[PDB]
Amino acid sequence: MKTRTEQRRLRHKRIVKKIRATNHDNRVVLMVIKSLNHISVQAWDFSQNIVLASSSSLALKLKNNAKLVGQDIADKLVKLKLTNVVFDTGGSKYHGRIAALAEAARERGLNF
Amino acid sequence: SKKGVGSTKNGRDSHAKRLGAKKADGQMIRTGQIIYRQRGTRVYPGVNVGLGSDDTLFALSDGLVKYQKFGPKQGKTRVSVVKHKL
Amino acid sequence: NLKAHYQKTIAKELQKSFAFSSIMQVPRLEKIVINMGVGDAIRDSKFLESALNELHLISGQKPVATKAKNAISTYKLRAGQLIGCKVTLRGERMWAFLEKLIYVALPRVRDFRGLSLKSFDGRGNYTIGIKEQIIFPEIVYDDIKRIRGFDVTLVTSTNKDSEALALLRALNLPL
Amino acid sequence: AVKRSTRLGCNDCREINYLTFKNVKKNPEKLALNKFCSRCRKVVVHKEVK
Amino acid sequence: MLQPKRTKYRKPHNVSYEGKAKGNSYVAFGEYGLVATKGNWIDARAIESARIAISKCLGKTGKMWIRIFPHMSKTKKPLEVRMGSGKGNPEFWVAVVKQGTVMFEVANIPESQMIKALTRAGHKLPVTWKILKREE
Amino acid sequence: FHFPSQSVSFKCASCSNSFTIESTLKQKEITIDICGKCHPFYIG
RNA sequence: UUUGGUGCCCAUGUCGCUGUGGAAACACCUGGUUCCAUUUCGAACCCAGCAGUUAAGCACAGUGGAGCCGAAUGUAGCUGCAGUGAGAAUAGGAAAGCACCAAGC
RNA sequence: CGGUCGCCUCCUAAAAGGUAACGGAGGCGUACAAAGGUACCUUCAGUACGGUUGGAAAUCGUAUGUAGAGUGUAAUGGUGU
RNA sequence: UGGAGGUAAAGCUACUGAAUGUAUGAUGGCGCCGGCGUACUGAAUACAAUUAAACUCUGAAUGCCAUUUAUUUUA
């Protein structure tokens, strides 16, 4: 069967395809990734295929659920003065540490 | 000699649905107006185009219409409405 | 218990038999499935409830329904009407059922020779289809129209068949 | 012809304000909907009347 | 008469049989081939008569092969009928022979008897023919 | 959910080795008088 | 540049085969203590972590086996024996890339 | 006399559209309060093997396949996470 | 200048049917002590040629659609 890892990429592809077919507004996305032992998020941009920012375990992160992953990039985003983005549920559900990430993004001044 | 087939087989016929290329590349379009009508999906919605779920493919923005190949062997044709220069 | 015996001695013995540098490449067991179905009759004659009873009293999880992938009715199967039940057992209950199967009541027929010939599809499979279910001790009375065994089909993570032979022979399965 | 389309009425107006497609061969229950009324100007429970 | 077993329709178009050959110009199995200088229609009975005639005079070691097969239906309404009122019935089967088309190929038997037999068999065909040698 | 399972002591006059890990709790004193030691197929 | 994520275009990007690596990572993995879950199974999803793993997904070398793609000569049909020039076959290539991000750099 | 008269799909129809006859194939005078919407999970038909009543496949598990799966309905187009 | 397109032509191991010879043989029958020479029927695995309006894995020209450019126009 499938590799149990290509499943999350398939979910990412189907969701991004549906959104980009439907999202007529031009907002950048806060992509999420939940690996086995780590998590990694990227503020991506569509219609240009470029990256605006990223925060990962390979980036500033101690041993690791953690709340130290959400508010780090919101200040960078407001430094780029977007403050209106679209969120990605990723290959996981909107639950667990993803909820903490979303709340940390929301509280700092981001409207999603 | 005048004696032929009575109760002749099906000779009925439907109407003709007036569809096809209502627009073509090279004409400016007002927003909202139709571009192409088709039974099925032989043209696909690309960028800045509205798809009404009655086999309707209309313009959702302003600009110029273009046609690009897509799919496995360029079997699909995707309609695009590129925006005017700013 | 037998899991602590298996994963401490037989796994090492198997890995030394076929000299390997991978601990997860040896013939092991991670999932088994047991199916059930009544093609003999669709009529509610000790069916859809007797399966529930027997599977609850023989397995560790409640039955789950499924319908046929097609619609073949040359023996009266229409209007949907799912038949049988299935348990894809895992975890500790997997080994509990394994121990119940191997060393409890299978030794009840003198010439129980099993099936070590022509039981491999080619991707590490094993099947045991018996005719009697009362053959087990944990059975009830007067709750069946006609005794029928439960087909057990076990699969593993090894595609090769020789390792399946080693796995079957390590637990002393009949030749 | 084969009458299959029925009406719907607002219990807070006792008028006729909706037309639904509800055959009577498989649905013996009355349709208790929550429909929008332009006189109540809001969502109101609607029952069956004809 | 090699009647088709099953057909999707019953009364289709006949053919546009002008132009060059869609194929069958090549010779595959036989040593002598019978080509045609133009195209026309061949009905079923003629094929069977020619085949039995060519096989009767054929020896016991040579082999012959047909390149055509009737795949077109035809309508011929009964006599005294008027023009119009639907379509008629099938009466026979028609094979289409375009220009430069080979119909028969024969081999594995002396050549003189074969050219004589091919002449005597092509005399039964409506289209004037031409002998063509084995292609290497 | 499902009725819990447990193990009660396994008894056999031809085994003398208890097979008591996890069968169920709905029964008491599981016992069978025939085992694999007397069975030629389940012997070495 | 080693590798992970990564978008564009969708079998000249793939299917499949043989070997070498995974430091950091990615996947396996120990389990269901709890958020959560299963038409039932921690299979799947989700949680806190590594005793070990290059076996597996990923890559790196070869393999034209499959599939794919495909020039030159001429070629029917075409518009007025002159332009027009396909499909089939064939030399023959092909083990994909284009961008972006953060480290090992 | 026979049949036909309204609507829908395809071919006739000659690579925009339309384009006939008493030309060739067919059907419709509908169903579903969920077969609608949203969010989520998830994806062929068969082939081969293994096996209790069970042959030719019933039920299943696994490789397999590149849509011959499905699509309420006659056909076309369309849709392979 | 580019596209909208499945038309003639060609193709049928690229489908759907139809359909020709070469090659091996499934499943049945026949003789037979666990298997058989199989005089038999003969799934298809590859090779060579075919046929279609309701077959299309492909694929023109003319023609139609608008702008770039020139000319006649008050239609």
UniProtKB/Swiss-Prot annotation, chain A:
GO biological process, one term: translation
Entry's Gene Ontology cellular component terms: cytosolic large ribosomal subunit
Pfam (any one): Ribosomal_L18p
GO molecular function term, any single one: structural constituent of ribosome
Alphabetical list of InterPro entries matching this protein: Ribosomal_uL18_bac-type (IPR004389), Ribosomal_uL18_bac/euk (IPR005484)
Keywords per UniProt: Ribonucleoprotein, Ribosomal protein, RNA-binding, rRNA-binding
Family assignment from sequence similarity: Belongs to the universal ribosomal protein uL18 family.
HAMAP family according to UniProt: Ribosomal_uL18_B (MF_01337_B)
Function as written in the Swiss-Prot or TrEMBL entry: This is one of the proteins that bind and probably mediate the attachment of the 5S RNA into the large ribosomal subunit, where it forms part of the central protuberance.
Subunit structure: Part of the 50S ribosomal subunit; part of the 5S rRNA/L5/L18/L25 subcomplex. Contacts the 5S and 23S rRNAs.
The protein, known as: Large ribosomal subunit protein uL18
Organism: Mycoplasma pneumoniae (strain ATCC 29342 / M129 / Subtype 1)
Gene name of this polypeptide: rplR
Curated annotation (Swiss-Prot), chain B:
Lineage: superkingdom: Bacteria
Coiled coil: none
Cellular component, GO annotation: cytosolic large ribosomal subunit
Signal peptide: none
PTM comment, free text: The N-terminus is cleaved by ribosomal processing cysteine protease Prp.
Keywords: Ribonucleoprotein, Ribosomal protein
Transcription regulation recorded as keyword: no
Gene Ontology MF terms: structural constituent of ribosome
Key word ATP-binding present: no
GO BP terms, alphabetized: translation
Similarity section: Belongs to the bacterial ribosomal protein bL27 family.
Protein name (database record): Large ribosomal subunit protein bL27
Portion held of the full protein: 17 to 102 of 104
From Swiss-Prot, chain C:
GO CC terms, sorted: ribonucleoprotein complex; ribosome
GO terms assigned for molecular function: rRNA binding; structural constituent of ribosome; tRNA binding
The protein's role, per its UniProt record: This is one of the proteins that bind and probably mediate the attachment of the 5S RNA into the large ribosomal subunit, where it forms part of the central protuberance. In the 70S ribosome it contacts protein S13 of the 30S subunit (bridge B1b), connecting the 2 subunits; this bridge is implicated in subunit movement. Contacts the P site tRNA; the 5S rRNA and some of its associated proteins might help stabilize positioning of ribosome-bound tRNAs.
Protein name (database record): Large ribosomal subunit protein uL5
Oligomer status and interactors: Part of the 50S ribosomal subunit; part of the 5S rRNA/L5/L18/L25 subcomplex. Contacts the 5S rRNA and the P site tRNA. Forms a bridge to the 30S subunit in the 70S ribosome.
GO biological process terms, semicolon-separated: translation
Lineage: Bacteria, Bacillati, Mycoplasmatota, Mycoplasmoidales, Mycoplasmoidaceae
Family stated for the protein in its record: Belongs to the universal ribosomal protein uL5 family.
Xref: HAMAP family: Ribosomal_uL5_B
Keyword hit for tRNA-binding: yes
PANTHER family hit by this protein: 60S RIBOSOMAL PROTEIN L11-RELATED (PTHR11994)
UniProt keyword terms in alphabetical order: Ribonucleoprotein, Ribosomal protein, RNA-binding, rRNA-binding, tRNA-binding
InterPro entries: Ribosomal_uL5, Ribosomal_uL5_bac-type, Ribosomal_uL5_C, Ribosomal_uL5_CS, Ribosomal_uL5_dom_sf, Ribosomal_uL5_N
Curated annotation (Swiss-Prot), chain E:
Lineage, opening ranks: Bacteria, Bacillati, Mycoplasmatota, Mycoplasmoidales, Mycoplasmoidaceae
Keywords: Ribonucleoprotein, Ribosomal protein, RNA-binding, rRNA-binding, tRNA-binding
Subunit structure: Part of the 50S ribosomal subunit.
Gene Ontology cellular component list: cytosolic large ribosomal subunit
Protein name: Large ribosomal subunit protein uL16
Family named by the database record: Belongs to the universal ribosomal protein uL16 family.
InterPro entries in the record: Ribosomal_uL16 (IPR047873), Ribosomal_uL16_bact-type (IPR000114), Ribosomal_uL16_CS (IPR020798), Ribosomal_uL16_dom (IPR016180), Ribosomal_uL16_sf (IPR036920)
Family annotation (NCBIfam families): rplP_bact
Gene: rplP
